[PDB]
Paper text:
HIV-1 and other retroviruses integrate a DNA copy of their viral RNA genome into the genome of the host cell, a process that is mediated by the virally encoded enzyme integrase (IN). Each step of DNA integration, up to formation of the integration intermediate, occurs within a series of stable nucleoprotein complexes (intasomes), involving a multimer of IN and a pair of viral DNA ends. Because integration is an essential step in viral replication, intasomes are targeted by an important class of antiretroviral drugs, the IN strand transfer inhibitors (INSTIs). INSTIs work by chelating the two Mg2+ ions, blocking the active site and inhibiting the strand transfer activity of IN.
4d was considerably more effective than DTG against IN mutants E138K/G140A/Q148K (7.3 ± 0.6 nM; FC = 5 and 117.6 ± 11.6 nM; FC = 45, P values < 0.001, respectively) and E138K/G140S/Q148K (1.7 ± 0.3 nM; FC = 1 and 49.2 ± 2.7 nM; FC = 19, P values < 0.001, respectively). Last, we analyzed the structure E138K/G140A/Q148K_DTG containing all three substitutions. As with both the single and double mutants, E138K makes a salt bridge with vDNA. In the E138K/G140A/Q148K_DTG structure, the positively charged head group is 4.1 Å from Mg2+ at position A and 4.4 Å from Mg2+ at position B. Collectively, the all-atom free energy model simulations successfully account for the effect of the G140A mutation on the change in the binding of DTG to intasomes and highlight how G140A mediates the conformation of Q148K, leading to polarization of the Mg2+ ions and weakening chelation by the bound ligand. If residue 148 is Lys, the mutation G140A leads to a repositioning of the side chain by +240° about the γ-carbon, bringing the ζ-nitrogen to ~3.6 to 4.4 Å of the two Mg2+ ions. This reconfiguration, in turn, polarizes the charge distribution around the metal ions and weakens the chelation with the bound DTG, reduces its binding, and, consequently, leads to drug resistance. When the intasome contains the E138K/G140A/Q148K mutation, experimental density is weak for conformer A, which stacks on top of the bound INSTI, when the ligand is DTG, but is pronounced when the ligand is 4d. Despite their detrimental effect on fitness, DRMs containing G140A/Q148K combinations appear in patients demonstrating their clinical relevance. Together, the changes induced in the structure of the intasome make viruses containing G140A/Q148K or E138K/G140A/Q148K mutations less susceptible to inhibition by DTG, but the mutant INs are still able to mediate integration of vDNA into host DNA, explaining why they are found in both cell culture and PLWH.
Residue numbers in the entry:
A (entry chain D), B (entry chain J): 222 to 268
C (entry chain A), E (entry chain G): 1 to 228, 236 to 268
D (entry chain B), F (entry chain H): 2 to 44, 57 to 139, 149 to 228, 235 to 270
G (entry chain C), H (entry chain I): 212 to 277
The structure:
Amino acid sequence: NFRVYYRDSRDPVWKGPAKLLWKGEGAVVIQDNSDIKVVPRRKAKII
Amino acid sequence: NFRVYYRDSRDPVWKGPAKLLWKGEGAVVIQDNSDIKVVPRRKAKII
Amino acid sequence: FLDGIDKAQEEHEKYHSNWRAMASDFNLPPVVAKEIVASCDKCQLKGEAMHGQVDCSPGIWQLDCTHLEGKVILVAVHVASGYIEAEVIPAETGQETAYFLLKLAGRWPVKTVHTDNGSNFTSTTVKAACWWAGIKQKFAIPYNPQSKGVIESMNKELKKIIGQVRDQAEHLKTAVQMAVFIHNFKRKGGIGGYSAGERIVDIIATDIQTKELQKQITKIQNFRVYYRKGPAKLLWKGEGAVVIQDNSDIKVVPRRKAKII
Amino acid sequence: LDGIDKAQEEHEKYHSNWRAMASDFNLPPVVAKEIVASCDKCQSPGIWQLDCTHLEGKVILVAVHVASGYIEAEVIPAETGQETAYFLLKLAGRWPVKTVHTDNGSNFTSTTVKAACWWAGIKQKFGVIESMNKELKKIIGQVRDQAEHLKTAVQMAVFIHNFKRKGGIGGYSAGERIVDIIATDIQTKELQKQITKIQNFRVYYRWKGPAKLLWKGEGAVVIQDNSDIKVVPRRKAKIIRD
Amino acid sequence: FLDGIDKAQEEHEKYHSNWRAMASDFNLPPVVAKEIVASCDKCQLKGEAMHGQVDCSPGIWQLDCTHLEGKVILVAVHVASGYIEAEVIPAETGQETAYFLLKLAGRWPVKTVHTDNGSNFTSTTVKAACWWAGIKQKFAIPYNPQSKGVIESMNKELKKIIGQVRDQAEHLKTAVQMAVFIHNFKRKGGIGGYSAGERIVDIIATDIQTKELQKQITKIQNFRVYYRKGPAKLLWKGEGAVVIQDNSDIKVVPRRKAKII
Amino acid sequence: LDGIDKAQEEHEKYHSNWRAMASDFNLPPVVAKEIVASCDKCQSPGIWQLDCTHLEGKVILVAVHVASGYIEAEVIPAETGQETAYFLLKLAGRWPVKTVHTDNGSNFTSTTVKAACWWAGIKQKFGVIESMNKELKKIIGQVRDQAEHLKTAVQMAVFIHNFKRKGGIGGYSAGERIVDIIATDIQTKELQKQITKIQNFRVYYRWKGPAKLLWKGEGAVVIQDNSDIKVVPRRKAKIIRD
Amino acid sequence: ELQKQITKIQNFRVYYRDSRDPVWKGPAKLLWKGEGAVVIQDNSDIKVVPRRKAKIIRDYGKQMAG
Amino acid sequence: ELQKQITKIQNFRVYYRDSRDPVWKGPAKLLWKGEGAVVIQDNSDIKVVPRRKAKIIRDYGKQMAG
DNA sequence: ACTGCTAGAGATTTTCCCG
DNA sequence: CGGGAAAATCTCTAGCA
DNA sequence: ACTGCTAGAGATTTTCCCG
DNA sequence: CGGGAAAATCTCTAGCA
Ligand SMILES: C[C@@H]1CCO[C@H]2Cn3cc(C(=O)NCc4ccc(F)cc4F)c(=O)c(O)c3C(=O)N12
Ligand SMILES: C[C@@H]1CCO[C@H]2Cn3cc(C(=O)NCc4ccc(F)cc4F)c(=O)c(O)c3C(=O)N12
Ligand SMILES: [Mg+2]
Ligand SMILES: [Mg+2]
Ligand SMILES: [Zn+2]
Ligand SMILES: [Zn+2]
């Protein structure tokens, strides 16, 4: 599995770790506390 | 001689032509209507 | 390094040192220090340094709203060519956006629109209009203008040209249409040294022509190719290589170890 | 290169146009153009038509590309010169409009429309439009029940006419037809530009008299002398500007 | 092209076409179209695409003020090493800036400060303080943060570390000093894989040592060099080349065509 | 490399330290360190001193680097533990502070100061300070007329003491002295780090018994066997980790 | 028949990008076109490109210029 | 005497940039230091660098490491 | 499951042109 | 095959707000 | 007459290490 | 001299507001 830390939406504070669902070129689909988010890969770190 | 067109200070509109006085690496000293200005070379075009 | 690792984790709880500092100050290997950093949630503060690439298919349009002189301008760009469509509208309302998009669909083969999540673009009127015209709506990741950087850069270009020709018109709508004309037919460059109008005509004509010719070729050229497998479909052959499509997976193999039937 | 004589014979036999020789015999378009222009016996994308139609007390301004039947129409608030000029300036910004045919109406002879056409580089000139208007009205009546406002039904009808209704020889819609016509015009303009660029040179070969240049190839130079096309190697000829 | 040029200037007054469009549409050479564009004041809207380089001398400090949690932080960075100095101050006042800069001058060999044109940095108290300490003030081009991008990037780094360690302190001043400590001694990298404290100590010790050794060498090594000219001073010789200083102009010439006296 | 015997003779004759052999005989610091540590007969940058001084009804907190005489002083609003902890945390953020000597005062034995020292990794321990305080007071009295407030005169005196007053053997100021001392400490720490990194290896040469590694050069390997330093080619020896 | 059509396909030029490369690559020759992929030949090298990453055009200038 | 001092000068390493180049170049060897210029030797190539564009250090790690 | 780009200004490299 | 000049290509930035 | 930078995350290239 | 692994180097971005 993977850990994802992300900056989501107009909020400078980084959040995570979240579960990685889908990794595309440029964006990742994650799950954070039963919430599915789509983040650009610029604003995410996957471990 | 040279013509200088520049963006000066928090004003999006470009101004000129002005007289080139000094051309350094990164900045130019110009004269525009008896006013001497120092502009970064990012914000100036010299012809 | 059991003692060193403990003295590095204890220090990291206080200072959050980067991997180099702990590697140097506790004689840790780079992998061990990097592991110590990677297991600290307080130090996960930077995304990876790249950019995505927008969809550039011949049917996608990027739409956005911009503001000039207190008015609202709705702008659409055909991504593949740079051809734009702009119009001053009374307010950022789903009705105005729906009318504009119905116009664009009636003028050009618009298959998909990619916009941000503004209220006008997510309205039920716009969704009904796109459904009637058979337009697929793609919405950007919220608060990511890079997702539609093409229409954003077009907004910059349009505003620059409007500033250039604002004196020649009296109203903003006239100058906006003048700037649209200038961008579409009076500015050359790009892939073909074209104007945007020429490039869009080339792109769409090419799509039609290539579709028809490929249809004819596939109708005539019917063969099965065995390589290394199953009866792969033949796409292209020649120059010592064969291009095949096996189970909807296009792969390229050399002419050797392959036979065409 | 070697097929120039074949192209000449083909033109003498069938009077084919330069497009055909260029596509078939693998010749540059300039050489085929000269072949087709060397015989005396062998001797639209910019024209739009504007008309105003009234429907349910509202004025609809219709523009038809004559060569294709493609339409651009919209409901305008009033039959005034300003609205006509705005519509024409929009159309010129979307399509290469060279000249517009009009019916000597009040809104078309206004000074605003003339100024807009002057800025846009359009020429104003004062049967297809009537048939197209009737077809547009029929489609509007068909799809009126699907739109509350008349302008939306007008745009839906424009979409249907341009991309859904098909007809003609090859069964293409008006949008495909206008795209093909504009692409052909672009090719014609590119060829004219290349001919103008290369017509200012004079070539001396083997030295013989000056010859008009046709194609400056990578391995040969194609020239014309005494109403005849000859191929000479580049190293055996010199090209100068006059 | 006399007719073509006139039809291109007349079009440019209307559309402001780029050079490619007029070259294509009027058969103009690229130089002629570029000249037509260059003579239009309405089309001079873009500066050249590069960046300058800040002064990195061992004596220059870049100072700035930043804001966090409603408080004001005065920050100074030694440009050559990345070593920072930060302190929470009650207000952006020339008195606070003067006291801070007097402190910095009393702690490190501060020869020149480079700041923006904020009111506190242009105050007469700060000018009097810099005069007493022998500090040269360089002011940036107004509204160009790139002139002090080093201290701007340091503001970003300091705020990130403050966010990392804010819980460990109760007040902002304590956390700011903790972040200063962390940046100076707990983060390695850069030219020498150093911390900022180690790098600043290395830089200043190197400057002192090199100055002394060069003074001794110039006192001992005294020769005049003739090349191609006048009696040029000898700076360095060897490896087939000679470095000389003629009329305060340092140039490098090969060992050939040169004689040392 | 070839000068190892010369360095050994020099140490046996003059008891020189590894810095001298490294600078003179062109040896890596590890080899010279082993040479200087191989003889039994041949056998400060982090210590600061804190004191509180009262001047004109205001409390001045003075920190003196013991090894150099360099000072850091400032006027604090009150003689309290919080202000002392803030001052010490600032000092540790500016200089490598390892341990501070104090006079068992109320503000130094506070829990806040102890917590700050714990976070900063400083050790608290409870004649130079008195002389330095007198010198600081003299300079403050000298330059008081040039400053309205006492804190500004204090900082001016600190500047004068650190960079203008000079004295000692080579006539350097306190700032140059502290810079030299900290640079020497950094070199010492780097050498200790390298020694710790390389002391975990064992080398077999020509196979002979295990030998402690000294330097892994580009063209040779320096080892120690039976209290003797030998140079062997890299291809003639193997290095393993234990 | 078929050869003519294949030649007309190969007469088109494709501009394309790679997944991690932001600069558009030069006009490769078109060999095959699909719903989501195109097969090209760029400098004696055959690649398969997603349709969303490729711009296909017949550059009319060049055509008219041999 | 003089040779010792020259060797100590050449023991220092210089990081520097060029007028139009934003990435810092590697540790060249110091040959001469002046008020406004430094003379270095980067990969068998001698350059003169403005003092404002050069960072001069004796990297202690490396020194202590031979 | 989605995704920076564009056009203009300078600098540098290739190509063409006559020898 | 050799330089110059012209053209093409590459590098890099602001603004999109 | 002055001037973007920094540090961290991934990708790619060099170097070292034992054969 | 040959691969693998580790290390070094290079490329690239956000935030500084
Ligand atoms: C209320 C809706 C819904 C949600 O988001 C807001 C705010 N916003 C902000 C920008 C913008 O910040 N452009 C500057 C920029 C920055 C980076 C880049 F790569 C490209 C760029 F254009 C827009 O363009 C835009 O349309 C909106 C918008 O519409 N909304
Ligand atoms: C009232 C004074 C006087 C005149 O100017 C204003 C406004 N200003 C603006 C920034 C700022 O915009 N930083 C963002 C940023 C953008 C680009 C970049 F390369 C680096 C960057 F940090 C400052 O840092 C700053 O100190 C000021 C300031 O002080 N003042
Ligand atoms: Mg936008
Ligand atoms: Mg700032
Ligand atoms: Zn951490
Ligand atoms: Zn213009």
